[PDB]
Design an enzyme around this catalytic site. Sequence first.
Site, PDB file in Angstrom:
ATOM      1  N   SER A   9     -10.303 -20.291  24.877  1.00 34.11           N
ATOM      2  CA  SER A   9     -10.011 -18.866  24.845  1.00 34.11           C
ATOM      3  C   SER A   9     -11.225 -18.104  24.346  1.00 34.11           C
ATOM      4  O   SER A   9     -11.989 -18.601  23.539  1.00 34.11           O
ATOM      5  CB  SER A   9      -8.796 -18.590  23.957  1.00 34.11           C
ATOM      6  OG  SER A   9      -8.591 -17.203  23.781  1.00 34.11           O
ATOM      7  N   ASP A  54       6.544 -31.181  30.012  1.00 30.27           N
ATOM      8  CA  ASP A  54       5.621 -31.194  28.889  1.00 30.27           C
ATOM      9  C   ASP A  54       4.188 -31.362  29.372  1.00 30.27           C
ATOM     10  O   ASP A  54       3.765 -32.484  29.680  1.00 30.27           O
ATOM     11  CB  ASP A  54       6.009 -32.326  27.925  1.00 30.27           C
ATOM     12  CG  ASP A  54       5.103 -32.415  26.708  1.00 30.27           C
ATOM     13  OD1 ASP A  54       4.321 -31.480  26.485  1.00 30.27           O
ATOM     14  OD2 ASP A  54       5.192 -33.427  25.960  1.00 30.27           O
TER      15      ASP A  54
END
Length: 330
Positions: A199, A35
């Site tokens: 992004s 994770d």
Amino acid sequence: STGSATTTPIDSLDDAYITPVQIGTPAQTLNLDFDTGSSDLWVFSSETTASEVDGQTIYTPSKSTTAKLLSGATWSISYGDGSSSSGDVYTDTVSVGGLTVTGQAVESAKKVSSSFTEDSTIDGLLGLAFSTLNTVSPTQQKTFFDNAKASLDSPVFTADLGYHAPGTYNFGFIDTTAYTGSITYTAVSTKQGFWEWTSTGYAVGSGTFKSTSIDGIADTGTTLLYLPATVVSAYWAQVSGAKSSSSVGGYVFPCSATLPSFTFGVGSARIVIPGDYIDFGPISTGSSSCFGGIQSSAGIGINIFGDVALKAAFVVFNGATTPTLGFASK
């Protein structure tokens, strides 16, 4: 040193991925959920409330000659999906794919929430975010990666998740045979303890690319792709019959639909998520309503590049003094 381990979907939807991890002496192998959005290595154990264990493999520290109680230490964590777990702490030897850490904090669960009990395939979590998020008290503990780092050939690990198929976690090296083209690296902020990056935009299907900054985290422990409501609306508007369902808890679409791809930007580069990756199947057995793999982050407080996004790429988690993230197509 290096390590290399295969990671395997837990079910036919890729709801999560499990990776075998050796704990203790003799080794006890547990299948953990790696994770990159948390920083605790915790396991089902011989200390877990018996009513809360259902099929998982447990760690028994009393059977490990190298286990030592970390006296006074406790842990307690809650995840974004509302699940939680808590317990005490041992140090022991932990190996992943041939890479060994001695003195690793192994957080032994005394309590786990129902979500964990109900998932027989996950024996615990292995956190790979920054150690500043580790919940051990009163002495915060380091992640497996943090402990391994100085010994690694290169201070990196990579995630190569498969679509309906196994993939690979590598530590300490970049497998140049595992991706196509070049890796595009992008800046990371560690201020919230996550692999947080920006992004450069998105496209829906064969549509034109929209240049727009989207701050989010690279999180292998989250199934889906959670993005701003504007972006998510633009995606699902291209699917006939798709709608946001309050009763189901997100966007659903007719199972008869063909889903468009979704492209996200990494610097000047582009990662394409095929439409099939965005199909998470009937909302309930036999239903013709299917659950979407791109969902709104509104009310999460953060955008999450979960497995739907990451499995479309070869991803480098670069833990150099100035951490960065790299993405390549594959």
